[PDB]
Design a binder for this molecule. Structure first.
Ligand SMILES: O=c1ccn([C@@H]2O[C@H](COP(=O)(O)OP(=O)(O)O)[C@@H](O)[C@H]2O)c(=O)[nH]1
Ligand SMILES: O=c1ccn([C@@H]2O[C@H](COP(=O)(O)OP(=O)(O)O)[C@@H](O)[C@H]2O)c(=O)[nH]1
Ligand SMILES: [Mn+2]
Ligand SMILES: [Mn+2]
Lengths: 263, 263
């Protein structure tokens, strides 16, 4: 419980750090009894690292790992995601026996400590290619062996998508066809994209959401929020604004719970 | 080899009948040893029913079942899909021990007779909400009981999406959490939408595709094809055209095998 198990996130800059701060605050809001840890890289300002230390039990400094895999990253219109190979450092955290990695663009809506009943590698399906798991939420076991194996495969073969999700799916390739218990229910990693892609399903299953994941190039922190009206201002033709409940929650927590700690 | 087992499709009009014909032609092309069955409703022309008899072993006339659920259908911008409850008639086919239902907008790329090793209900995940199965390819056991249960649920509750897929997911509730063997690999029902949603995944898994599913409002038969050049004429800004190989194959089979029976 308290000592040997953690939620782990990652930030390589101050932008994704506002995400990590909101994630962290949401985990506390829902009364986790596990540690909170964030992996941070040198591009995170000293000032931000100090703020991160008020929310996370530990801020762990690591080196950026970058795929440099511009062809594969362009293939999915995510030229900026090569630095997500930095996620692989999560397996080096052998101070813990089991952890849940969560993307810095996630938000917790309910206690999810029952994830620690799972075993490596448990993750939810990805809505793009559902025989791949989405790497935004996964339950794993820190291991120097698994760490080095993952580093080796990344250096030798890279990632089919140029980020962490490809390589993690290739390494944990039995996921689609194994033990159904290793398929986390989709409500533990609810892709913002699924809300508009199959709204009828969201309408009957979404009230049970435990985690929302703002996956895709547009992040909550790239909107403009007016605290007085609670209005979110978006770019034109944004399909996520037809169901904005999770975006508003994100901003509520940031303005209320994170903002006071920033100053 | 199975005289007591069939593939089953559905058509309510002459337009999806072109799809059924191409699907049936593709099952023959890949040497199925099973029977081929199409459910058709009164709106299919007499001349079309006769053409369907050259491809399918059985053309079975059934009444249209229509949810009339404009609210849920409109939720997913598919106002025409209420007649998909007609699919429920497939459970009445107790001449067969086991069947694979396939949507009329599917296209077989390899022999898939190994699907008959599965048991009801086996289906692939839906890319919008992957804890629901897509109802375009599924293995089931004809049964008067299951048939009547499904009709009663449709009459009482309707479908959460106004079509067959919602009601079938509600009825086969345990799919997301049961027996992984009942999760068909995504290659047995490859959603055309998944090609452009996670292109990197397509690039490394796509060569293994056994079935493609042209799901969504635009169907292969709504394009304009030039057989001289083998170019497909699309509506503007069509995302599927960046990877057109499956559409081209649909039109080749249509033009070579099917259109001669029509025009
Ligand atoms: O510039 C970046 C890009 C990503 N990340 C980390 O890598 C994760 C995966 O990236 P993202 O969530 O943007 O991928 P997606 O969920 O959109 O596929 C993020 O949540 C962050 O934890 C980061 O720290 N800096
Ligand atoms: O007007 C219609 C619409 C649907 N269908 C049948 O119902 C299936 C499901 O509809 P569709 O494939 O359009 O749904 P999607 O796969 O796009 O969700 C089709 O493949 C056909 O077999 C039909 O016969 N007539
Ligand atoms: Mn993410
Ligand atoms: Mn279909």
């Amino acid at each position: 419980s308290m000592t040997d198990q953690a939620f782990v996130t990652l930030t390589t800059n101050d932008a994704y750090a506002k995400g990590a701060l909101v994630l962290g605050s949401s985990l506390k809001q829902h009364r986790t009894t596990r540690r909170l840890v964030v992996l941070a890289t040198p591009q995170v300002s000293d000032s931000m690292r100090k703020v991160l230390e008020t929310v996370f039990d530990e801020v762990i400094m690591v080196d950026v790992l970058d795929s440099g895999d511009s062809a594969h990253l362009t293939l999915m219109k995510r030229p900026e995601l090569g630095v997500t190979l930095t996620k692989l450092h999560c397996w080096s955290l052998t101070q813990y026996s089991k952890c849940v990695f969560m993307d810095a663009d996630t938000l917790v809506l309910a206690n999810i400590d029952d994830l620690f009943d799972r075993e490596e590698l448990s993750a939810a399906p990805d809505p793009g290619w559902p025989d791949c798991f989405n790497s935004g939420v996964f339950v794993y076991q820190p291991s120097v062996e698994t760490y080095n194996q993952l580093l080796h495969l990344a250096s030798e073969q890279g990632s089919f998508d140029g980020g962490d999700q490809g390589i993690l799916n290739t390494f944990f390739s039995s996921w689609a066809t194994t033990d159904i218990r290793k398929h986390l229910p989709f409500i533990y990693n609810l892709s913002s994209i699924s809300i508009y892609s199959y709204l009828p399903a969201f309408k009957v299953f979404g009230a049970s959401a435990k985690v929302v994941h703002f996956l895709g190039r547009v992040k909550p922190w790239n909107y403009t929020y007016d605290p007085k009206t609670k209005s979110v201002k978006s770019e034109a033709h944004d399909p996520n604004m037809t169901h904005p409940e999770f975006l508003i929650l994100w901003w509520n927590i940031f303005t209320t719970n994170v903002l006071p700690l920033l100053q």
